[PDB]
Amino acid sequence: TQKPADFPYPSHFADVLGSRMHYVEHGNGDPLLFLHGQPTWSYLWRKVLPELEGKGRLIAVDLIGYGMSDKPDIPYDIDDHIRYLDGFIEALGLDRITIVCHDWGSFFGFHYAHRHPERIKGLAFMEAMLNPIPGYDAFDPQTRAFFQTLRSSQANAERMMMDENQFVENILPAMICRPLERQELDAYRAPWTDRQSRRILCTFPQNLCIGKEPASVYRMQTAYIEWLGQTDLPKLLIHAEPGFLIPAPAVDQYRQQLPNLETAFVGSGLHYIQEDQPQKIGQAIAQWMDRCGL
Amino acid sequence: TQKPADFPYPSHFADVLGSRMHYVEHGNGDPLLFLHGQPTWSYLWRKVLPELEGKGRLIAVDLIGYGMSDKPDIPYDIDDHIRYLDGFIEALGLDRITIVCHDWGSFFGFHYAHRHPERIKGLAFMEAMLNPIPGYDAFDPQTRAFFQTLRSSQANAERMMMDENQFVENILPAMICRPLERQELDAYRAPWTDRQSRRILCTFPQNLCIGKEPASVYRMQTAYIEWLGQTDLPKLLIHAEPGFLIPAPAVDQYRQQLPNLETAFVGSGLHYIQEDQPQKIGQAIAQWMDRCGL
Ligand code: NA
Ligand code: NA
Ligand code: NA
Ligand code: NA
Ligand code: NA
Ligand code: NA
Ligand code: NA
Ligand code: NA
């Protein structure tokens, strides 16, 4: 992957399970770990990070296979992603961690926090994987037919991702309210220029929990939600209108369901809200970490 | 003035300088003082207060001459409003105050807070008077025409306020996105049904600081903004899109200019944002008071 000229944070790499994972880093102190999802990378947070400079050690990591991380010769099943992100976090020896997470990055962050609660200081999340999606008819029409068709066969998934590159070229722009500049979209294309490598883009849409399927992802997500409902850890839910994974009424559900949950509304956004309201998102996290000067 | 049907807080009156000032009240603890501006009254906050019950002693006051307050035979210059609101606050012996303020209520609130900082616990404000308006070119052309014409002569100000009642009849509904129900508009009309009494409505738009005019208001506002820039008191700026006195780019400036400032975006609104997003406004204040240990 060629590093985009508009990503002004330094590239570092950690050795994890015989591969290298990329992350950008800024500052010192307790870590603020930023976790992206499908089909993005740490670039997604480039305009959010400036709002949090000086609030701790910013670490925005690319999941294995994504961004500027290596693409080892592996299936990129959910277990793979779990192992490699755990390996990353261990490789850096992170503790006292504030996770800032989105989409699959929230599945992984929440599952990590569930398994290592002692290592967490706080959880900030947006357009996250919280209560499982109960079925296709309760799922947002924006993507419902897209997911059904992709999930119906490996051939369909491969056509859609490898030949048509639909997640990058179509879904991503469609789930951002403002128009992307060409070099911004090019940044999202840049890890995925090779057709065969785009097989990797199949696995997240094949594994999104819908109607308890896949069953392993349903069990893990159900289990971290049960745990989230008991944890006293400070939580921040950043939300947009109309949103996607977290529409407006679901926001209020979480205020009641999750202890010590604060919220911040950032206005118009669908799924990749960092592209619509980065400054507001960053400032929401900053204000929440500052705790009114207490 | 008769109490509106949808204003469900009990009416009280304080004796201040030989007149009665109306206020509504709820609860106990450290006070939340709600301050309205032009051409409203405490009714403006009727749907905000329910979000804050149990968070302190809620006190929403009508400026002298406004709402259900008496209309004594006085000039109603800015100094008169200062003396009567000081007299109100003293009459109730309010201390450890969280001021929640809007438009001219913010001018009076901030001027009080600047002179008596030891009486203040926090400041929550929206569509407020912070940096003076730099010139008439800060308004869109319709609004600029309104102010210019009103300010050009006493006869124009009297026509517009006394004969046309334009602040109630036009500006008010124009600066709320949703349509007002008939009883809501009637509530705003009700203190101003008398033509002679509407002379009072001239003073605020004649004294709004625009391009350093008038000089008294420029001095006082410049002084309290300097003070706001230094105090660590908790502050909350609630804002809407596109807003009016505080448009989006100003919000961002205040984020950096004023210490310990939290922001809360409430979505669509112009000036009288209480009428568009009262629940969100109230909830934003509630969350910020909890964060701030208020
Ligand atoms: Na490897
Ligand atoms: Na949705
Ligand atoms: Na915010
Ligand atoms: Na009097
Ligand atoms: Na006093
Ligand atoms: Na206007
Ligand atoms: Na701020
Ligand atoms: Na600040």
Numbering used by the authors:
A (entry chain A), B (entry chain B): 3 to 296
What's in the article?
Haloalkane dehalogenases (HLDs; EC 3.8.1.5) form a family of enzymes that catalyze hydrolytic cleavage of carbon-halogen bond in a wide range of halogenated aliphatic hydrocarbons and their derivatives via SN2 nucleophilic substitution followed by the addition of water, and releasing a halide ion, one proton, and the corresponding alcohol as reaction products. The structure of HLDs is composed of a conserved main (or core) domain, consisting of eight-stranded β-sheet and six α-helices, and a versatile cap domain formed mostly by α-helices. In the present paper, we describe the biochemical and structural characterization of a new HLD from psychrophilic bacterium Marinobacter sp. ELB17, paradoxically possessing the highest thermostability among all biochemically characterized wild type enzymes from HLD-II subfamily. Crystallographic analysis revealed three unique features of DmxA that can contribute to its unusual thermostability: (i) a unique composition of catalytic pentad, possibly lacking one out of the two halide-stabilizing residues; (ii) enzyme dimerization due to a disulfide bridge; and (iii) unusually narrow tunnels connecting the buried enzyme active site with the surrounding solvent.
The crystal structure of DmxA wt was determined by molecular replacement and refined using diffraction data to 1.45 Å. DmxA wt was crystallized in a primitive orthorhombic crystal form, encompassing two protein molecules in the asymmetric unit. The two molecules in the asymmetric unit represent the dimeric form of the enzyme, which was also observed in solution. DmxA wt contains four out of the five canonical catalytic residues in the active site: the nucleophile D105, the catalytic acid E129 and the catalytic base H273, forming catalytic triad, and one halide-stabilizing residue W106. The second halide-stabilizing residue, which is asparagine in HLD-II subfamily, is Q40 in DmxA wt. During the refinement of DmxA wt crystal structure, the electron density present in the vicinity of the active site was interpreted as a water molecule and an acetate ion with an occupancy of 1.0 for both molecules present in the asymmetric unit. The water molecule (HOH511) is situated in a canonical halide-binding pocket of the enzyme and interacts with the nitrogen atom of one halide-stabilizing residue W106 Nε1 at a distance of 2.94 Å. The side chain of Q40 faces away from the halide-binding site and makes polar interactions with the side chain hydroxyl of Y68 and the main chain carbonyl of L203. This suggests that Q40 residue cannot be involved in the stabilization of the substrate nor releasing halide anion in DmxA wt active site. Interactions in the dimeric interface are mediated by 3 salt bridges, 10 hydrogen bonds and, interestingly, an intermolecular disulfide bond formed by cysteine 294 residues from each monomer.
